[PDB]
């Protein structure tokens, strides 16, 4: 008799994958600290950790990143799709459709869902980079099997190998987005998966939810804010003006964290490094951002709202050569690893997710003929 | 502290759209009896009822079925998709992808979500029929704006206008599938919709869940059963053999109905009429089915399991010229009206659906170097 609309404060699964202490500002993947993973690991190793629940030994990881380079190539049909398609399409809708097409082109039904997962995960960056070039009137530049995941992403975007700070930054950035708290998109995945529909279907649902505007994170309005604050001399009137007629500060606040976002803390170092190595309009943006961070923490911090990952992730994505409407799709590249993991975890004891609805209408109405209406 | 995995017995919304009394075998759309709707209404009128919550007057319905014929045409890109695509693709995956593409080709963002809904709903049959022809090596035969929804569906399948019993049957069949009890696919829709992602996204999630094998209804294993029971002399050993080593009887039982499915009762008349008007292998199938219904009700009825809509819907779909792997997609044609309705209803007071997950793992693990592993 109590309608739990929103499912806020209902538990839909147990999990071993990701733990967040929003009180202490702590984040663990399989019980490993995101700080340590950011510092000592990489995308490939962290993905294995998260899919399989433990750090790989040298042979396991070697097998794992072998599958990951092996299947980066898109089939011709979907590549045909990419260059033939409307070029003012939303990159998310491109990603959604391409994954859907990938499902059609896949005919191996004997395949373990994790193997199917690897290959999907490995193609996201190829879809994303390929569309970005095509959109800019350049040409598909193919994945280089020799390269590691994050380097190859930037490779297929630039056409040339990225310098090592850029690919580090890319790698840590993707690591920071692989998984987080149960949400609409991870859950949309699980709903589809719990009917044992195919992996591609589930991931299409994940993307379909993630691109929703109401979805937490994937905001990137923060870059826009830094932009319209012109100088960093201008920042305090801007922000104080915003607060006085209570308007949000982009890249601040969080549904779970009541402290500085550990992902933001980690990502800040790369935002700063990239910016100061670029030196341009983009270094001045970073200067804006510190000024905003400073006064933002001052006024908002005592209410337990601080900068979050989006606050720096949008400077970084920018420095790394992506255009703002690709940001969510690069997010998706990371998060799809999380989606696959949860699906794997959820379907060991599958339960099809079918909630109830409470009918509060009338019944037994007489069917009235249309002229009498 | 209680994990509600499956969300069985959790209410995720109030609703005014559809009411099922599984105890009394009753089914209402907007408080109108499905018996009366089947008998006195049509697909177009029932769709309006369900989208808007009341029977239309002559001007409202006239407007409504105007929109419905106006937008049946698919854009060239997706038609290009259809004839270019793998022809051993699952019709559901075709439908999923096409709807996704439809989203890309749509650039009207100022559009009411119900108007967007009409046009989507009207194109499903065009996608389905077009693929069925192309798959069979025939050619796209375009929608005839002059015709009504259900007649035009069969038209685009056959290439010629269907006789009136066939289009009646089609019409009532689609009516019977527009909406039903909250489930994985309607809910997958709602999860995406509750982030205010676009309609196409939500519907892609709906299809993605509906094609899941674990999903209630959309079974159509019943046709297969009638087929392998050769004569209807053969039926009693077959079924009794099945029951003795407890195997399910296809087209029987239901999660909510503990009586004869009202939709099955209504659909039976058309299964019977179509069959006996065909007279062939397909009339003998129907004879099989009655025999199975008879002994099935005898042995299973006292446990409150009876035939359900799938029991006859698969004979009908068959008689109407569809191949068995198109059955779910014709289902989808109907149900998408329900999906649109629920989304419309859910987002008047939107709440983004983000459940919680309970972490039952460890934290604070020490990151061990890969050689030490």
Author numbering:
A (entry chain A), B (entry chain A): 1 to 373
Q: How do the authors describe this structure?
A:
Citrate synthase (CS, EC 2.3.3.1), an enzyme involved in the TCA cycle, catalyzes the condensation of oxaloacetate and acetyl-coenzyme-A (CoA) to form citrate and CoA. Thermoacidophilic archaeon Sulfolobus tokodaii strain 7, which grows optimally at 75°C and pH 3, has two genes encoding two distinct isozymes of hypothetic CS. One of them encoded by an open reading frame (ORF) ST1805 is termed ST1805-CS, and the other, encoded by the ORF ST0587, is termed ST0587-CS. We confirmed these two isozymes to function in high temperatures as CS and determined the crystal structures of them at resolutions of 2.0 Å and 2.7 Å, respectively.
On the other hand, ST0587-CS exhibits 51% sequence identity with CS from hyperthermophilic archaeon Pyrococcus furiosus (PF-CS). ST0587-CS crystallized into an orthorhombic crystal belonging to P41212 that diffracted X-rays up to 2.7 Å resolution. In this crystal form, the asymmetric unit contains one monomer. This citrate synthase also forms a dimeric structure, the 2-fold axis of which coincides with the crystallographic 2-fold axis. The final model is comprised of 373 amino acid residues and 40 water molecules. As observed for ST1807-CS, each subunit is subdivided into a large domain with 11 α-helices (C-G, I-M, and S helices, residues 1–212 and 321–373) and a small domain with five α-helices (N-R helices, residues 213–320). The N-terminal region is folded into three strands (residues 18–21, 26–29, and 32-33), forming an antiparallel β-sheet, whereas an intersubunit β-sheet found in ST1805-CS is absent in ST0587-CS. In the structure of ST0587-CS, six putative substrate-binding residues (His180, His215, His254, Arg263, Arg335, and Arg354′) were also structurally conserved. The numbers of ion pairs composed of residues of opposite charge situated within 4.0 Å were 36 and 55 in each dimer of ST1805-CS and ST0587-CS, respectively. In ST0587-CS, an ion pair network was organized by four residues, Asp93 and Arg96 in G helix, Lys211 in MN loop, and Asp198′ in L′M′ loop of neighboring subunit, and continued into hydrophobic center of the helix bundle.
